[PDB]
Structure formats: structure tokens, C-alpha cells
């Protein structure tokens, strides 16, 4: 008799949902978390006196799985105001910064987006079966820049949507797969307004950590923190999991939910399938990071795009007041473009967009540097989505979940919740 029935690896949303599924089944469930905190690529902290989100935290009811979880646990929405900006700006790869006044900005970006996903519906009638139509399979041969070039856009709108998709790719759009973007838009209802409503509009009452804690308290599982898994060995119709302090924990099955980019630091015995190995060594493309700045001046509601060779690719105002000053929430698609390491560099680069600003405070998360994320959100490279199956397939008594392994909203929390549900299904399968 092994130590536990099931061992979940990773205290993210995927792992939390899997642990809940298997605990409600009455299995002896243990969850191991490398970091000293739960939530994984979601993390609520505080800066300059207020609550902030260094990772994922915005959800929507058009996302079925996490919304069902919120319903089950009674978690309401918290709406961030995103109405009538005071200044919308677009910075180009050459450093040019032009202030467009909102409505024109918004409608030209709508044009660029809709023409980018012109064939979304036909290519993806079933967003949850990404490669149902094989025309999506053939489009996975293409980049998103490949179609951006063939859509004949404005220079303004080309810059807009290319910075958008560089954010979504955590990379340069030349490496960004096309079918992933099209499928994500499909899941959103093939509609620009509805899909955009699921961007940075609604957060979870009590926070992503609130939902994580609800799921974990419910599951009844044992949660160990600051316990990294370094190796897994399938033996004896079960599995042995090795921690970084060389302790062995036996289980009937293990559900791996740690990000793809980190699989390279876990040794599997015997070796995983060849497609799984290829995926593990490729990983995914996103190299983003989160950054909050706080400057003396009040700049009101503000939004700003920046294309892929500028650093502060996504910028919006978190809060504003004549006395407090201004707080800038910012997402960077690639950490090699700006090192939030440097308050000098952050001040320089934000002054390039809001000339004459006094930087009071800085707070940053470099997800690319974190050993247990080695990247940000899921972002498929060219040709990856079409073989997603290899990453999903269970290998013996080893089950694989995680946002990157989901079929629907792969680039956000919902993908992780769906991963966990599927993992629980497979666990029930192999333990009944
Ligand atoms: C800046 C940013 C903004 C985002 N915005 C949103 C958003 O607004 N809305 C949204 O829905 N999603 C958003 N996303 C996506 C989102 O936060 C993630 O997709 C989601 O958390 C995926 O969860 P996961 O379980 O699949 O993986 P993770 O949450 O990363 O879970 C992996 C866990 O495994 C652990 N781990 C790794 N290696 C080991 C090991 N060897 N042993 C033990 N444990 C290990 C890690 O510590 C981590 O806790 C955002 C992400 C980022 C980074
Ligand atoms: C949650 N999204 C998934 C793709 C990129 C990420 C995102 C969206 C908006 C602002 N910052 C990050």
C-alpha cells in the first residue's frame, strides 16, 4: 500500500482543481507545491498601499469552468472601471509615442482585431476541439505576423494589433502561432465586444487565492509547501516521487500540473513519450513579466500600447488621485526588453512615454526568472497546437494537467480549471 492514492504536483489552479476532484472522491490525496505559496502563476500582493495582482486575476462568465467553480463556491465578481480613458497612447518599435484620443484608438484596434480573426468562426466552429476543421491544422503552419502582413492594415492599427499579439505571445509575433489566437477568439464567441469584455474587467471576490483556498479546503487533501519535486519513477503499478531533499513518496498515481517550461528540471523514469519530450524541451514562447510603477503626478485614466521591441508593451492606470499620484499597471511581453531589476531603467522607459514623470515606487514580478514558471501565460508557437495531444496524453500512471494542456481558454485560469477537471476524470478512471 502506497503512501497516498494520488499525488498532485503544483499548487496552481490546475493542481488545486485536480486535488479537489480527487478529494471529493474520497481518495487519499497529497498536494506538493514547490514555492512557499499557493496560486502558481496567480499571486495577489500589495504595493504603494493597495492590493495588486502580479499574475492572473481577471475572469469572465464566458469562461465556463472557473465560472462554474465560482458558482459552486459563491464567489462574486469585482469590477474594475475601464470607461472613458483620459489618454490613450501608442508607442512604436522606433520609440515614437503618439497620443491618440480614445474612441478612434479603440475603434481602429477593433478593426485590426476583427480583420486579424476574419476567418475565426469557419476555422474554429468548436473552439474546444481546436483542430476539428483541418484548415486550422493547415493554418498552424503560419505565424500571426504572416497574416498581419496579408491583412493590409493602417500603420497605427498594425502597431496596435502587433503589440497586442506580442503581449499574447510573450514574444515577437513572428514566432506566434495563428491557430491559438483564432481559437482563443472563438471561445469568446467569435465576437470582438464579448471577447474584449473578458480581458481586464472582472476579478474574483476574495481573490484567486480565495478560490484556490476554497477548492483546497473542500478537497480535504494534505498540502505541503516549499517541497519541490525533482524526479518521478513509475514502479510497481504505482509511482515514486522524489523531493529535492531526497525523500521518496509513493502514490498510486501522480498528476503533474507544473508549467511546461519547468518540466526540464524533473527526471522521469522511464523516459516520457517522444512527443512529450519534444514539448518539454520546446516549452512555450511567453517571456512576459508584471510591473507596477508609482509616480508623483496624477495622469488620470490612461492606456498605452507598445510594439514588440519596446519594453512596456501593455500599460494601464491602476489608480489615480491628486494626492496619491499615479499607479501604472504594466505587462511586458519579453523581459529581455526591460529589466525591472533597474528602477533607473523603469524610470527611463516610462518617461519615454509620459515625459517628465517622477517615479516614487516600483514593484515587479519576473515570471521568466522564477524557476517554477520560467515564463508567463501559455502561448503556442508555430506548429505546436496541432500536436497538443502529445502533451495531454497520460503516460502510464502519470497524468498531465495545466493551462498549456487545456483545449479551450488555454492562456488563462479557465484552461487550468479545465485541466484539473480532466485530470480528476482520468484519476477516477485509473483508480476504479
Ligand atoms: C502576468 C500574468 C497575467 C495573467 N492574466 C490572467 C488573467 O487576467 N486571467 C486569467 O484567467 N489568467 C491570466 N493569466 C494566466 C494565469 O495566471 C495562469 O494561466 C494560471 O494560473 C495557470 O495555472 P496552472 O495550474 O496551469 O499553472 P501554475 O498556476 O503556474 O501552477 C504551477 C505550480 O507548479 C509549481 N511547480 C513547478 N515546478 C514544481 C516542482 N518541480 N515541484 C512542485 N511544484 C512545482 C509552481 O510553484 C506552481 O505553483 C495571467 C498570467 C500572468 C503570468
Ligand atoms: C491573460 N492574458 C493571456 C494572454 C496575455 C495575458 C494578459 C492579458 C492582458 C494583460 N496582461 C496580460
UniProtKB/Swiss-Prot annotation:
Q: Where in or outside the cell?
A: Periplasm
Activity regulation info: The catalytic rate is not significantly affected by pH.
Q: What does this protein do?
A: Involved in nicotine degradation. Catalyzes the conversion of nicotine to N-methylmyosmine. N-methylmyosmine undergoes spontaneous hydrolysis to form pseudooxynicotine (PN). S-nicotine is the optimal substrate. Has lower activity with some nicotine analogs, but shows no activity towards neurotransmitters, including serotonin, dopamine, and norepinephrine, nicotine metabolites and common neuroactive drugs. The enzyme is stereospecific with poor activity with (R)-nicotine as the substrate. The c-type cytochrome protein CycN is the physiological electron acceptor.
Please summarize what the entry says happens upon disruption of the gene. Answer: Deletion of the gene prevents nicotine catabolism.
Pathway membership: Alkaloid degradation; nicotine degradation
Enumerate the UniProt keywords alphabetically.
Answer: Alkaloid metabolism, FAD, Flavoprotein, Nucleotide-binding, Oxidoreductase, Periplasm, Signal
Consequence of changing residue 377 to Y: 2.8-fold increase in activity. 7.5-fold increase in activity. Unstable, loses activity
Q: Name one GO molecular function term.
A: oxidoreductase activity
Give me the reactions it catalyses: (S)-nicotine + 2 Fe(III)-[cytochrome c] = N-methylmyosmine + 2 Fe(II)-[cytochrome c] + 2 H(+)
> What is stated as this protein's family in its record?
Belongs to the flavin monoamine oxidase family.
| One Gene Ontology cellular component annotation held by this UniProt entry | periplasmic space
Additional record remark = Overexpression of the gene has a modest toxic effect on cell growth, suggesting that the reaction product pseudooxynicotine (PN) is toxic for the bacteria. Coexpression of Pnao, which converts PN to 3-succinoylsemialdehyde-pyridine (SAP), can rescue the growth of bacteria by alleviating the toxic effects of PN.
Biological process, per Gene Ontology? alkaloid metabolic process; nicotine catabolic process
This entry's comment on induction and repression of expression is: Expression is up-regulated in the presence of nicotine.
What remark does the entry make about the cofactor? Binds 1 FAD per subunit.
For domains, the record's comment is: Ligand binding is accompanied by structural changes, including puckering of the flavin isoalloxazine ring and closure of a putative substrate entrance tunnel. The product exit passage is blocked by nine bulky amino acid residues. NicA2 has probably evolved a restricted PN exit passage to prevent its accumulation in the cells at an undesirable rate. Replacing the bulky residues at the product exit passage by amino acids with smaller side chains effectively increases the catalytic turnover rate.
Q: What class of enzyme is it?
A: oxidoreductase
Q: What is this protein called?
A: Nicotine dehydrogenase
Task: Provide the gene name from the record.
Answer: nicA2
Coiled-coil stretches noted in the UniProt entry, renumbered to this chain: none
Q: How does it assemble?
A: Monomer in solution. Homodimer in solution. Forms homodimers in the crystal.
Q: Which co-factors does it depend on?
A: FAD
